[model samples]
Target: NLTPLFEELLQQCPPGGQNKTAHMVSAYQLAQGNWMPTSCHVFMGTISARRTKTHPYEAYVKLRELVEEHKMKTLCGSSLGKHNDWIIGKIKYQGNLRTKHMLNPGKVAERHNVYNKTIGSVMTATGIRLEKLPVVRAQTDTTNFHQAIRDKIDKEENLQTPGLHKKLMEVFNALKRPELESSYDAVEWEELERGINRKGAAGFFERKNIGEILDSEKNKVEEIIDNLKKGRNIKYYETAIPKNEKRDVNDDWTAGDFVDEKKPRVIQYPEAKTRLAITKVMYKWVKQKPVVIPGYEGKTPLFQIFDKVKKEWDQFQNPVAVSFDTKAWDTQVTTKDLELIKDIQKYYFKKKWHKFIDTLTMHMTEVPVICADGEVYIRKGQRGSGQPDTSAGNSMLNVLTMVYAFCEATGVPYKSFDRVAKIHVCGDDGFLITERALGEKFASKGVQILAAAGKPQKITEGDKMKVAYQFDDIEFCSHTPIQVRWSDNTSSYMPGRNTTTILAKMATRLDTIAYEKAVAFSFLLMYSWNPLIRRICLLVLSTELQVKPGKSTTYYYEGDPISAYKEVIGHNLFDLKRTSFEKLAKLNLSMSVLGAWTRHTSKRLLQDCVNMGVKEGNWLVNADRLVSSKTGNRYIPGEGHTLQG
Candidate 1:
């Protein structure tokens, strides 16, 4: 009902009338039913600021009437931009169309249940003391001030695994290395320094704090341990964004894009930065595979893994793929989980390195919540542990526990798979791509054992859990749809944002036709006769991105291109300095690595779409240039036959 949302509405737009019930209902209608008339990546486009001004009057007025008349779906309408009011009987609740999309905050209600009302209520019920944000603003803003966020908004089968606990320790030991103590010392502090102090936070992080880490002549990892005593606090704010087409956003919606910085005994900089190199090889060593994933030559490959599995699913096991993700993992990572982390460190890190692990464990438990009313809270035991530092080892141990357990239950041994081998755990999310029935056990019985070991997070299927049979949806977006003409006799296979986003004009609210058109037009350049066109096309498909945002001057484009070419291939990306960290954080809040990367890439492709507004003059040059000079453009018509050279 609108009871909860109405309370929030009245907070901003008070009512004076005896009973403006009709108007209040209408205001709630606008809040729930309205949508933005912007691009799909509206977060990316606002480089030009007419956005500060909300939608047009006639359009806004028309949307209100349509929703009232029940004549249209919300996605078909545009939202009224922030700051306007309809004060007849009731008024309120519309700000930053691009940020707070349609304001359907059922997101909080769902999470309040997931965390049993602790985190969700702690986040929203307490108002952000907005005025004090500047003073309390940490080196890493204590407040999750990024508004681009406040807008958006699992199950088990397996019964138990026998040797799961022992295997957990086994996986933990792999990170042991003689190098950790000496590694950062010998690392190319100059060339590699850029990635060091990058994208992480917990509490009270400031520019000087960063400078201190950068300047520390003493090993900063040690400095961080010394700096992180038990008393320091960690403040977290909740964030949620839609799950891709895989889950029903209208039903399951938000992926846990939750948790943000606000703390200090919890410094992740020295640990996150220095450990960049240390933990860089974790995913690979954690679970070794026979052949490395193709086209991915980096440290950790994403999506491509999703690609390999999807192809197998489409080619052989059609209509069957099961994936499982843990519930409230950020909070579920208990005190015992950290000990495995610490013990794992013991086997790998130098004896001298033990203190940091111990120090991290202490503060993870000490994480305190800075409520909106300015009260500090120490959650029972699971607050600061979600920080990046232990994520690799911590997450590794959990997967190993599950993996080992799956093996024990299935009667397979430790090392990992054949037909049942399609298990993939890229952090808390696990994908076991066998047929659906067996997957039911992994979802049904096996997860009970998984949670049995993982206290506080007992298995429950009601929340963010999904198991599918005879389904065609895949996230990180699937590419199996392409080339289906071979089997299905059509070329209509397309996927979500991860693997060529399938665009829409109007789904519920707002429309990004230009983006869809831009992306659509760019696809034309692919599989062309010109090798150069394919190169540009490949660049667009391999865009870069969890990534966090810091300050205005923070460097982004400095690092090497991830999963793509060596550098920014297009000349157009040069002028996008305004799309730097803080700007996107301000409007887009989340600024996830891939989303922002997609944003920039979208902006580029958008221009690519723009430059050829009519696709006419460029044709004057492109086709003309294609019939290159005499001996110039290869495959001289007289020299080659088809399939074979």
Candidate 2:
């Protein structure tokens, strides 16, 4: 198998060098060969069939034919019990606590350490007070809070008398709750049952009987189809419309040397607008936001730039961060796997007729993917790629759950399985494996781990290996046990290569002058507060602008580098006037005499030379004039529906 050979080559190659390149290359080659080939399905059009004149009945028949021919899967419903299915059922204390421990082994020591370090100051800063908890329970009593009512209905509701509404709900949700062992038991059993039933055992509609299904539902299907056919569901556009050229190792192509050929981009019909709406509502009904980890709660992913720089100042205290690459995570999720993912929400209610909210789980199950080469294909993954509703985090968790199960079933040690839980995953990218052996063990159990270019410092035979972890985009490399010197002369640990990824993105998209101007403006604002970051920005801008004139690189600037830089900075300073008044107010102070004592530097420093009595026109003053002129119109602070000075 490609995986076995790939691993074997990986073992032989040096962990971090030219030799590592060969190993990575082999892994990538193996991935490309074993996984499905790349398709041109990335592009999507904004328009849809609901806006068109063509009848939806005709479109429905065409879509059905595609499914019958195996070019697509049916978009119908799922068997997983819907949103309220798992509604914190009955809280029975009987389930296997082992899974509970696995799910959450409360790290008391870690918790205590943080609490001890900060709680004293916290409590002292804000004088604490205690209040009795809200009494949700019905009272028999001493009539503690409420007075007796005169009417029978009001008396019954007041807690002194009997009330079916409160009484029945309490009995069903709590008093008569069912018993169950561990959270994992039900899911494990359900999967086993599905395995036993075998293929084509039971589902919405089997693939083999499309003809039967079509014949049976002919009237209903056609009726809905006719309604949608009246709406627009497609967009007519031109493809290869010069998204911008990139640097190729091949030949040089000067400006106007070659012209791109355009082709019509046809976005085909899929689900009707009505069906799509239902799918959206259903997704929202069941959707859950990811947990905000303690340190990462208020911090944004962009703020990670500061965290990385902080390590540069104190690398010796932290560990080197390892960037984990999960191959192609989204594409790796197959249609069949979604059933497993949904199991987290899958459960059975005690009552037989536990009425459910009608949802469109199956309606959004499949999609049509049009490749750039004029070939049409269907998506085998759970959801359409790049769809707002798609949950990469949920999918990753599902994969982790299955991986844990596999490890347990195959008798992999609990200690090894514990490492898997500790591994931090962000979408497809993850921290490195605990060790080479841990990765191998996972691979033996059908999990493939590939190393990407970044993260994980190069290793030698005798060197100790450890991993750095990330929460969101912020990393904690120094948290690992093993440590190393920063560089040959430095005694500190190696600081992370900060901002390279973002900078690389800016370089790749340096296409048209307009686009470059936008990029440059953003970069200036992003790095404006940090001197170190500005230096990095300068390095990136200079290198991208120095490309040979005739080359077909992403470079759009054809003028002097400093001149381009000045122009971009000038434009951004002017645009700074458009910022919210709160920020504009801050900028105003920074440009005034108050800046001398505040030591706050405005980004408009370069243009503020007019304040220093330069004869040249003042751009900062011009921006201020514009902002002041527009104050009553566009500036909004708080709204009573009017602007106040």
- Best candidate per TM-score, number? 1
Q: What tens-digit string does per-residue lDDT give for candidate 1 at 434-480?
A: 65545555555565555555522334465223565643444321222
- TM-score per prediction, in order, is 0.42, 0.31
Runs off by more than 4 Å, candidate 2 = 1-300, 305-324, 345-374, 381-383, 392-395, 398-423, 432-504, 507-645
Instruction: Return the top candidate by lDDT.
Output: 1
- Per-residue lDDT of candidate 2, residues 409-528 (tens digit): 345543344333333443333343333334333333322211111111224223222233322223432121111222132221111222322222233321133344334433433333
Per-residue lDDT value at 147 in model 2: 17
lDDT of 2 at 274: 25
Per-residue lDDT, model 1, residue 586, is 28
lDDT of each: 0.31, 0.26
Q: How many backbone clashes does candidate 1 have?
A: 30
Off by over 4 Å in 1: 1-167, 170-188, 196-202, 205-222, 225-303, 310-320, 368-374, 383-386, 415-419, 435-437, 455-465, 468-472, 476-495, 498-645
TM-score of 1: 0.42
